Amino acid sequence: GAMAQELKERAKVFAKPIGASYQGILDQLDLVHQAKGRDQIAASFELNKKINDYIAEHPTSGRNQALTQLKEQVTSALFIGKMQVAQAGIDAIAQTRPELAARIFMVAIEEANGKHVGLTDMMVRWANEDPYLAPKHGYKGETPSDLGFDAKYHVDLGEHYADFKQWLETSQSNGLLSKATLDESTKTVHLGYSYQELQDLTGAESVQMAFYFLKEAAKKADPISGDSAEMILLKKFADQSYLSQLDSDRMDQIEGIYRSSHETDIDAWDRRYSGTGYDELTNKLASATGVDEQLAVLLDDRKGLLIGEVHGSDVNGLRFVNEQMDALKKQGVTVIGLLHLRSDLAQPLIDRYLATGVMSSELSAMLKTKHLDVTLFENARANGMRIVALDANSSARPNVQGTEHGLMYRAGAANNIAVEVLQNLPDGEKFVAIYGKALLQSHKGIEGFVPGITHRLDLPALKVSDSNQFTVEQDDV
């Protein structure tokens, strides 16, 4: 009857039963209550994002007025005083990416106190223009705890499951791709390699095949947007921890680029290695005769050698380091650096080989993919020298998703690796590192400046010829 409905309605109006969506807001509120540091700021941006999403979906909900006010109080707390200076740019980002906004927010707090003026605007501009900082949903839902490894993706292979499985199992029986686990009931692979790491193993056909089917599954998950297979894998299948770690590291690298532009002594680099300094180094070099004396000039009051490699052949650097390893050793060199290999994926494999004398399948596949001579590693091990991988984790692609940010990111991250691995060897120990010529020079783009490897390590960029003649390459202005 109408009485029963009248009573039901009076009860409903007084104690509005809580939907799933409003429950999410209350849960998120508790997080604002309990969290500390940057977590509390992120939780506050995420509270706001939940409120906006709620009001959008329940336009005529009675709860909107009290949620709106809550949203303004939160916003007022966050952007009080000088923090309002960066508010418009940070809040616009917080609309889609609360954790990202919170990181920038912490930087803006410092900028309000007068640290690194300009960094905040730089981070905001990257967040808007770098395709890799765009909103990335990734894989949502429960992920297994069993895996002996950190999953980077959880990819539903659908129709490509059987092929992927075959080539994965062929790979695993040859010691490759061990950090991958199949769940047949959902046709998914839990995958412990990044897109870029896999690409570095495709000298092995079985990996190349597995990689091919992985990519097909990705393309089929998103046929409509123009996203590459790599970007699709992130936005649709990335583990959430992996996403955070990517976003975090990219923000770190932007700060790195910023600091390096102010703290690198480029004035002194140009005095030593341009103009008169260059003329003088070139003259002293040309008067020396043979490998021994050229080395002594190049390493005189310098921590190492930087040798350029050109796209195509000119593998003269790789050849030289191998054939003349003894002459390098006698001049104090104890470390050989290769931009050809990625530090995260390769260094554990390299180190285990130098310790045990046993080369893993995985390293053997990487060397093959990169066309590196196994004898370099044997000659290094026999000579007591360490080989170190110098590249970061992103695409070497001079084009990455259509902007300059991929280029700057790689140069930034490679600069950091170089400083950590090459810049402070024990007293007397020198290095020889081989870089592609693009990293040796500075990046002077409209979208930002990055010091060259040369600038960061206070060294000239070198070229070695078919007859072991060194020359100093002029700075790319």
Numbering used by the authors: -4 to -1, 3596 to 4068
What does the paper say about this structure?
To date, more than 10 MARTX effector domains have been annotated, including several domains of unknown function in Vibrio species, among which the fifth domain of a MARTX toxin from Vibrio vulnificus CMCP6 is a Ras/Rap1-specific endopeptidase (RRSP). RRSP catalyzes sequence-specific cleavage of the Switch I region of the cellular substrates Ras and Rap1 (18, 19) that are critical for a myriad of signal transduction events, including innate immune defenses. Structural and functional bioinformatics and cell biological studies revealed that RRSP belongs to the TIKI superfamily, and it is composed of an N-terminal region mediating its localization to the plasma membrane and a C-terminal region responsible for cytotoxicity. In this study, we determined the crystal structure of an RRSP from the sepsis-causing pathogen V. vulnificus CMCP6 (VvRRSP), and we demonstrated that it is a metal-independent TIKI family endopeptidase.
Given that the catalytic residues of VvRRSP were successfully assigned, we hypothesized that substitution of catalytic residues with nonfunctional residues might stabilize the active site and the adjacent flexible region. We subsequently determined the structure of the RRSPE3930L/H4030L mutant at a resolution of 2.3 Å. The structure of the mutant RRSP is essentially identical to that of WT RRSP (RMSD of Cα atoms is less than 0.5 Å), with minimal differences in the conformation of the active sites containing the essential residues. Like WT RRSP, the active site of the VvRRSPE3930L/H4030L mutant is arranged similarly to that of BcR135. Luckily, the flexible region spanning residues Arg-3988–Gln-3992 in molecule A of the mutant is ordered and adopts a loop structure close to the active site. To evaluate the involvement of this region in the function of RRSP, we selected Arg-3988 based on its interactions with the Switch I region of Ras, dominated by negatively charged residues. This residue was mutated to glutamate, and the overall conformation was confirmed by CD spectroscopy. In vitro KRas cleavage assays showed that the mutation completely inhibited enzymatic activity, suggesting that the flexible loop may be involved in substrate recognition. No differences in the active sites were observed between WT and mutant RRSP structures. Therefore, these results suggest that residues Glu-3900, Glu-3930, His-3902, and His-4030 in the active site may spontaneously adopt the catalytically active conformation in the presence of substrate.
